[PDB]
Amino acid sequence: AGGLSQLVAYGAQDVYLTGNPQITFFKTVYRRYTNFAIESIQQTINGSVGFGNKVSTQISRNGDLITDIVVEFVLTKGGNGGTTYYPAEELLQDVELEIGGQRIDKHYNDWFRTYDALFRMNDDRYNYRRMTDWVNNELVGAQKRFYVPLIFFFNQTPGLALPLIALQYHEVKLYFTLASQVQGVNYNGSSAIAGAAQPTMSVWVDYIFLDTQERTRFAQLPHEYLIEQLQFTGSETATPSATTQASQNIRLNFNHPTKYLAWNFNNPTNYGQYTALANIPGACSGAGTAAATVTTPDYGNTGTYNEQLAVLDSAKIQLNGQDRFATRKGSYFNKVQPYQSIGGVTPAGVYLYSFALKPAGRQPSGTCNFSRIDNATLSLTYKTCSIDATSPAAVLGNTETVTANTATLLTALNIYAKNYNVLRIMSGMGGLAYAN
Amino acid sequence: AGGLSQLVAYGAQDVYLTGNPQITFFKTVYRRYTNFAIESIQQTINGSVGFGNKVSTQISRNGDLITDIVVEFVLTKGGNGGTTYYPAEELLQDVELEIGGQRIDKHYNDWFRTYDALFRMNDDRYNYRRMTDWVNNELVGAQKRFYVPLIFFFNQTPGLALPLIALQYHEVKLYFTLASQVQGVNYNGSSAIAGAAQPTMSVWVDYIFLDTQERTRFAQLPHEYLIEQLQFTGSETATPSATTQASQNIRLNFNHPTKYLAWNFNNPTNYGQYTALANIPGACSGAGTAAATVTTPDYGNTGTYNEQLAVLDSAKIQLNGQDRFATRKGSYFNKVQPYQSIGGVTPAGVYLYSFALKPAGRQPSGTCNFSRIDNATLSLTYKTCSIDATSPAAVLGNTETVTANTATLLTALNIYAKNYNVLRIMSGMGGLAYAN
Amino acid sequence: AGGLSQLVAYGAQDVYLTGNPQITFFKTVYRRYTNFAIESIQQTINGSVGFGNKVSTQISRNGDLITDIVVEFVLTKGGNGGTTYYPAEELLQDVELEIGGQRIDKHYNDWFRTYDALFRMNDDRYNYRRMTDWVNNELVGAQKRFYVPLIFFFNQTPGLALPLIALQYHEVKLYFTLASQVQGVNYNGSSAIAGAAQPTMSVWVDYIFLDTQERTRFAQLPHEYLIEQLQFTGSETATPSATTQASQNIRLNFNHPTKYLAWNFNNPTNYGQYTALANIPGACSGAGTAAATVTTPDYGNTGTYNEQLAVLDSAKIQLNGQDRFATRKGSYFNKVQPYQSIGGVTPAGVYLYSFALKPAGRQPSGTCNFSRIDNATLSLTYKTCSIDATSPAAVLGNTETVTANTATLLTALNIYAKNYNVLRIMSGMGGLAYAN
């Protein structure tokens, strides 16, 4: 009886499962690795740290490889609960990676916002907001240290660790640009908060110290790294209307084998606002009360999952004038594309089309070479922004092809592309194999 | 000092870890794959789409392989907040997969509900409810597009992609059956909502386009796929009592190497109701107020994690009259079996017994061949449904072997089995290797 | 058009991705394993089960290997909602694993609490609280069965399953120690609850039944298992102050290659209290009301994510008098170290420093050999516990280096270390390869 009687229940169908076993689940032989050690070492910041300033850092040569890089900020909030929305993330307006004077990659705060909405999830996502925002209903004058982790190719997997020991003739530098106005920190809407303190910044880099043999190999052999890059040519001007369904054809200007496309429609006035403001809880300032105004967001709750507040009705991509795929609704790129390829949840207003089976995986799993496409176009169709945004009965009970009239402020269309490239390192210098 | 001093801290115990390294963590060599392309293409639906109708789809031969399949619905809700519970999931009452006139697999909406409770988790689970339900407190007349993803063997992993190019003489068809009455959409309890609109449906299939060489291999060589199937012989009649602890012996009728058994006790009146209704928040209509009634659920909050509202007291499986394992409580199959083999959280009323180490993994990891077992029996023992369901003090403060008196409505016992089978494809035709 | 036109978009950059494919994503060849069967079998408990008693279990020789071990408790709560905090976890005060009279590992309830805060996440974490606590607002007299899963080396992965068949001359035993006082079960603060019932306990072990060939191999060949151990030498006395920033140097006493260090500052009066109590919602009894008292916690909500209530200001580790790394804030070890190496969220008051790239992975990925370090020291600096804990305006709006004055009760410093060791099994006996 018990488990022993199940072993005897053996048939001809068990041949495909346990005939001539190849593996066993009860004796794992673990692999031996190269000895190493990790150390986070602070960097020297060049320039005056402050709102709207540009500072830079030259990675000091302390170890052999570098992996994680974290930017620490110390901020004091100037409003009460729910008056900030990822202020430390917005403060890092853009960051540029440079090797030997050559730009390797460059990221922007809106990419950080888009990456978080698509590729982070669950408790990891909430821990990221602890690191970049106040999440415990803090009041005016609350001071907190923030940690903004960079997400370049060598920051996301140790298998792509940048070998400083193999770059003795090339300097690795980071160029930071700080935001000028950060909601709930030094500005409240358009009005500056008097006495707002300037931020304090520090850059920390995680170094890998290698053993003698592997140290000789990294310094003497040629290296080829399959890296990822971000492409972003600037915001596009979206033209959603309140009386009809407007349409647009945005000529894409991407290159290289691309893993996926990600885009959003943002109101440039408010950071991370990808949906329309409405008089429903969490969608505007003072929603549900007599102080409600659809002009100002509920800053702490800027994001939403309500598709009714998104602006995109349908979309398709055209490749040299012909449809790459049939037109799908905006909710398809927000719900189904992430469901099929990511496995998390994406707030409304952020859209994805993946050419890869696993876009969040470092291992390539399907790409499209935009360098061989003369004309790639994103054909868009917007909803009719005809719903009264101040009426909860109108917002919570309408049809599929309409949205709130406040959606006309979503005029900044940001389109991102993640591509692959090859970083060759030899003779103490590194350079990208493909420039377009 | 720092990391370099840790490298010198090297001893005899490091032999098992870093002696003669076999791998390294700082130089991943990514694998090269076969070139391909993906495209979601809409299908033609045969039949009249409507409540209680049967429609079918013949997969058009656009590409070489097919992977994901999504069913789109457009529904208009007829109630206010919390009056629907996965209506798009319930609308897809059953779906049958057919190759060359032969049924490969067939799923049911209650399986979709059971699969979601056991094998989805975290934000992925919440995104699935966005795709199949209203989750933003929408009101009467709210229209929304829903996406129901199918979970057949070729829908869950690209490694089992169905080769249409290798099936030139066999037709692949899907047979859908739409539910007649959907709570909060066209019915409110037992009463039909006047003017309810019929649903609109579309079927979308993701095709894989292969390169020349791999296209020749799929069309010329014989293929063998290790696939998974669902077994379900219909609901069993549970007989829980309010005066004593009833017991039952359900003769199982499964075959093939089975990964796991999953079952629930459902009140057939309400979709997804696996637990008893009670006058505690979320467990009945208007709970905690003067309008409370334990006759009607809080439809939007039909599920629960409260074990006190589950009906099963203990259970064991018998194999040819002898115990396959010792009797365990119902909470063991709801909490511990999922904890040990899945790693999520399962609402009360859904139970699991796994023969596999990783039941959610495609790779077989332990099965039981039910084709070699003459008598397999699920021995059940129910709690005494003696608690007053209208008393919060009685429901929130009782013992282990009792439940609410409303648990006597959980009379539909659905037992599911997930088994493996082999799909052989050769000479343009496909067929299963094992029929029993 | 469509997907076929993307295949033709092929360039010279595709050489690194799809030239001479090595793998394919659309034809997975699954591996065949050794036939086995699993069965959970109840053990005999030696001794009188009760609060503050020591009981033991000798693993009966029913199967060939053992994997999961679960301890079942049945408890009756003596308070209302929010008056318990993981009572079943605290009840298992310590558990010791013994093979042939030799201790292999020993765990404590505070380690269970620390492990849960660091290495569990998402729905898995919530399911663990369902198994060890009341989570549905149960009232006085509510009875519930609890399941405490052990987390020894053979409990966390089947690849380290303990071979009882290879230990015919060595006895495997578990030594349990039950807590004396459990909040909300038999005590309310310092006052005993009259009529509190003694707990009932049962131990269940999952056995693996192997096929004939693999059974002969396990019983005849020598085995070497790379296992993990917990190190804990007892609580350290922390000395945080309310008038200045105190500092300490705790001489660590660890050995063997260590994966990570984890520590917390606990008020020994309250289980799992790692942060200061304050008059903000969830941080003290009756917070926000006229019955608020910062002397008693909100037991059901003892944990918090508010860094302002943590006590540690900065920390660094010294190796033979020299800095292993530069000083970082306490929030770095609570937010960034888990973000970089775990990927979940860790409540405030629990800190981590990882020597491994993946500390939660069984496969070694970086260690530090503490057996070769003469002096390892944890240098600590505490915040100034000068904030009025009864003032929400003072707690929700202060600076980085201060905390509530109630933080002076966090006087128990628990430092944990997870190391590797080798378990050799030969001639029917097992023994560890390294003792220090």
Ligand SMILES: *[C@@H]1O[C@H](CO)[C@@H](O[C@@H]2OC[C@@H](O)[C@H](O)[C@H]2O)[C@H](O[C@@H]2O[C@@H](C)[C@@H](O[C@@H]3OC[C@@H](O[C@H]4O[C@@H](C)[C@H](O)[C@@H](O)[C@H]4O[C@@H]4O[C@@H](C)[C@H](O)[C@@H](OC)[C@H]4OC)[C@H](O)[C@H]3O)[C@@H](O[C@H]3O[C@H](C)[C@@H](O)[C@H](O[C@H]4O[C@H](CO)[C@@H](O)[C@H](O)[C@@H]4O)[C@@H]3O)[C@@H]2O[C@H]2O[C@H](CO)[C@H](O)[C@H](O)[C@H]2O)[C@H]1O
């Ligand atoms: C995003 O979503 C989150 C999750 O839903 C929201 O948090 C929830 O808010 C609702 C709560 O029931 C729930 O507990 C909470 O989780 C979040 O809401 C915003 O942030 C929260 C923290 C609230 O802000 C706090 O609100 C109270 C303020 O305190 C003052 O309150 C007065 C009533 C007192 O008279 C005064 O003395 C202050 O309180 C004292 O100090 C506080 C800190 C102590 O807690 C309190 O003792 C209990 C007193 O100590 C003696 C805080 O300054 C502020 O940080 C939301 O505020 C809404 O909900 C409150 C429960 C309510 O009291 C608020 O009304 C006050 O403020 C509004 C204007 O905001 C005034 O018109 C009103 O007269 C009153 O003064 C208010 O309804 C926050 O939400 C508001 O502000 C947002 C800013 O972007 C946004 O505009 C939003 O729509 C607003 O609702 C969400 O952002």
Ligand SMILES: *[C@@H]1O[C@H](CO)[C@@H](O[C@@H]2OC[C@@H](O)[C@H](O)[C@H]2O)[C@H](O[C@@H]2O[C@@H](C)[C@@H](O[C@@H]3OC[C@@H](O[C@H]4O[C@@H](C)[C@H](O)[C@@H](O)[C@H]4O[C@@H]4O[C@@H](C)[C@H](O)[C@@H](OC)[C@H]4OC)[C@H](O)[C@H]3O)[C@@H](O[C@H]3O[C@H](C)[C@@H](O)[C@H](O[C@H]4O[C@H](CO)[C@@H](O)[C@H](O)[C@@H]4O)[C@@H]3O)[C@@H]2O[C@H]2O[C@H](CO)[C@H](O)[C@H](O)[C@H]2O)[C@H]1O
């Ligand atoms: C599942 O769990 C969820 C999470 O807990 C629940 O959501 C929460 O509900 C409690 C809220 O505090 C919390 O914010 C929310 O997240 C969910 O509850 C059900 O769905 C929610 C959305 C509520 O439904 C909304 O309730 C308000 C209704 O509006 C009417 O309210 C009247 C009081 C007004 O007079 C009338 O004008 C309407 O409001 C106006 O329109 C709305 C849309 C605007 O928001 C409002 O402005 C603020 C007004 O605009 C001018 C909505 O139609 C409805 O969708 C739950 O309803 C309960 O909680 C409400 C806060 C409360 O107001 C409700 O009372 C009303 O309805 C009950 C009957 O339902 C009447 O007896 C009462 O007189 C009053 O009219 C109610 O207590 C939903 O829960 C209820 O219905 C469920 C149906 O299955 C179920 O029966 C449940 O037990 C009920 O409680 C959970 O389903």
Ligand SMILES: *[C@@H]1O[C@H](CO)[C@@H](O[C@@H]2OC[C@@H](O)[C@H](O)[C@H]2O)[C@H](O[C@@H]2O[C@@H](C)[C@@H](O[C@@H]3OC[C@@H](O[C@H]4O[C@@H](C)[C@H](O)[C@@H](O)[C@H]4O[C@@H]4O[C@@H](C)[C@H](O)[C@@H](OC)[C@H]4OC)[C@H](O)[C@H]3O)[C@@H](O[C@H]3O[C@H](C)[C@@H](O)[C@H](O[C@H]4O[C@H](CO)[C@@H](O)[C@H](O)[C@@H]4O)[C@@H]3O)[C@@H]2O[C@H]2O[C@H](CO)[C@H](O)[C@H](O)[C@H]2O)[C@H]1O
């Ligand atoms: C679900 O859970 C909720 C808690 O989370 C419950 O609410 C709690 O109920 C207990 C209260 O102590 C607590 O405050 C409350 O939160 C809920 O219980 C049911 O609903 C509550 C609100 C009670 O209903 C009220 O009961 C009184 C009725 O009024 C009549 O009372 C008579 C004594 C008078 O003689 C008669 O004139 C009526 O009063 C008049 O009209 C009302 C509307 C006015 O408010 C009142 O003036 C103040 C009078 O005006 C002249 C109300 O209509 C009704 O809403 C529960 O009722 C139980 O508890 C009451 C305290 C008690 O009085 C009730 O006895 C009455 O009703 C029973 C029949 O139920 C009669 O046989 C009896 O003669 C008497 O008339 C009763 O013990 C409700 O619970 C009952 O009904 C449930 C189904 O609806 C269920 O069947 C339950 O087991 C019953 O106990 C929970 O449902």
Ligand SMILES: *[C@@H]1O[C@H](CO)[C@@H](O[C@@H]2OC[C@@H](O)[C@H](O)[C@H]2O)[C@H](O[C@@H]2O[C@@H](C)[C@@H](O[C@@H]3OC[C@@H](O[C@H]4O[C@@H](C)[C@H](O)[C@@H](O)[C@H]4O[C@@H]4O[C@@H](C)[C@H](O)[C@@H](OC)[C@H]4OC)[C@H](O)[C@H]3O)[C@@H](O[C@H]3O[C@H](C)[C@@H](O)[C@H](O[C@H]4O[C@H](CO)[C@@H](O)[C@H](O)[C@@H]4O)[C@@H]3O)[C@@H]2O[C@H]2O[C@H](CO)[C@H](O)[C@H](O)[C@H]2O)[C@H]1O
């Ligand atoms: C941890 O975080 C959780 C998530 O926030 C908290 O749960 C939330 O609490 C706030 C709710 O709005 C929310 O719905 C809930 O999720 C949790 O809070 C603690 O646990 C919860 C479940 C509450 O305990 C319940 O509180 C109600 C008690 O019932 C009695 O209430 C009286 C008002 C009635 O007069 C009496 O008849 C009782 O109710 C009856 O029986 C109950 C079970 C029925 O539900 C009710 O019908 C609706 C009646 O049936 C006829 C329960 O015994 C108790 O388990 C929190 O309690 C706070 O919030 C309640 C909403 C409020 O009513 C409570 O006030 C009562 O108790 C306080 C003292 O606790 C008294 O001073 C007051 O006079 C009143 O009697 C209370 O404000 C729990 O929180 C409290 O206790 C904790 C113990 O550690 C802790 O001390 C905390 O700070 C306290 O707030 C969090 O622990």
Ligand SMILES: *[C@@H]1O[C@H](CO)[C@@H](O[C@@H]2OC[C@@H](O)[C@H](O)[C@H]2O)[C@H](O[C@@H]2O[C@@H](C)[C@@H](O[C@@H]3OC[C@@H](O)[C@H](O)[C@H]3O)[C@@H](O[C@H]3O[C@H](C)[C@@H](O)[C@H](O[C@H]4O[C@H](CO)[C@@H](O)[C@H](O)[C@@H]4O)[C@@H]3O)[C@@H]2O[C@H]2O[C@H](CO)[C@H](O)[C@H](O)[C@H]2O)[C@H]1O
């Ligand atoms: C989508 O957005 C649009 C634009 O914001 C919105 O239209 C606005 O509605 C308010 C009205 O003052 C504006 O002129 C109009 O632009 C639309 O609301 C829904 O459709 C509109 C056209 C109205 O419907 C018309 O109502 C009158 C009725 O005779 C006619 O048959 C119908 O087409 C909205 O009705 C609301 O506003 C009316 C002015 C008011 O008279 C209605 O009350 C009647 O009906 C309600 C139930 O719907 C009864 O309870 C009440 O006793 C009375 O008979 C009503 O308040 C309509 O909104 C309503 O219906 C939709 C579903 O179609 C949703 O449930 C809304 O939540 C609900 O308010 C938005 O759908």
Ligand SMILES: *[C@@H]1O[C@H](CO)[C@@H](O[C@@H]2OC[C@@H](O)[C@H](O)[C@H]2O)[C@H](O[C@@H]2O[C@@H](C)[C@@H](O[C@@H]3OC[C@@H](O)[C@H](O)[C@H]3O)[C@@H](O[C@H]3O[C@H](C)[C@@H](O)[C@H](O[C@H]4O[C@H](CO)[C@@H](O)[C@H](O)[C@@H]4O)[C@@H]3O)[C@@H]2O[C@H]2O[C@H](CO)[C@H](O)[C@H](O)[C@H]2O)[C@H]1O
């Ligand atoms: C489980 O479900 C059953 C069936 O629903 C339920 O039993 C019902 O209780 C209500 C009663 O009217 C019904 O006849 C009965 O079927 C049971 O409730 C708990 O057990 C029952 C038997 C009652 O206990 C008996 O109470 C009277 C007491 O003299 C005797 O020693 C005891 O065995 C429930 O007590 C509640 O209902 C009584 C009618 C009432 O008198 C009680 O009040 C007394 O006790 C409370 C504290 O318990 C005091 O605050 C109060 O001043 C007075 O002294 C009480 O309301 C009993 O419920 C109570 O106790 C359990 C734990 O045993 C839980 O805490 C409940 O939440 C609590 O109400 C359910 O457990």
Ligand SMILES: *[C@@H]1O[C@H](CO)[C@@H](O[C@@H]2OC[C@@H](O)[C@H](O)[C@H]2O)[C@H](O[C@@H]2O[C@@H](C)[C@@H](O[C@@H]3OC[C@@H](O)[C@H](O)[C@H]3O)[C@@H](O[C@H]3O[C@H](C)[C@@H](O)[C@H](O[C@H]4O[C@H](CO)[C@@H](O)[C@H](O)[C@@H]4O)[C@@H]3O)[C@@H]2O[C@H]2O[C@H](CO)[C@H](O)[C@H](O)[C@H]2O)[C@H]1O
């Ligand atoms: C951190 O913790 C410490 C110790 O708990 C706390 O200091 C306590 O504050 C209360 C006071 O009674 C105690 O003596 C003191 O130990 C500190 O609070 C913040 O700093 C202290 C020093 C006070 O600031 C001083 O306030 C008076 C002002 O003239 C002077 O310039 C300033 O340095 C706290 O101010 C609060 O308490 C005062 C007694 C009261 O007068 C203040 O009211 C004035 O200011 C508020 C706005 O801040 C106006 O709305 C009001 O009309 C009046 O002008 C105030 O209540 C100070 O707390 C306040 O400011 C901080 C940011 O610096 C946070 O926003 C607080 O939430 C807010 O209350 C803690 O930061």
Ligand SMILES: *[C@@H]1O[C@H](CO)[C@@H](O)[C@H](O[C@@H]2O[C@@H](C)[C@@H](O)[C@@H](O)[C@@H]2O)[C@H]1O
């Ligand atoms: C959207 O619909 C709202 C309700 O009718 C309008 O208030 C809003 O108008 C805008 O904001 C108001 C307050 C005014 O400033 C208008 O000039 C402005 O156009 C609509 O956008």
Ligand SMILES: *[C@@H]1O[C@H](CO)[C@@H](O)[C@H](O[C@@H]2O[C@@H](C)[C@@H](O)[C@@H](O)[C@@H]2O)[C@H]1O
């Ligand atoms: C469960 O216990 C409840 C409280 O005593 C009963 O109301 C309920 O009875 C059912 O529902 C009521 C409203 C009536 O319709 C009865 O005929 C029915 O049996 C119990 O099931």
Ligand SMILES: [Hg+2]
């Ligand atoms: Hg393309």
Ligand SMILES: [Hg+2]
């Ligand atoms: Hg079996």
Ligand SMILES: [Hg+2]
């Ligand atoms: Hg060390």
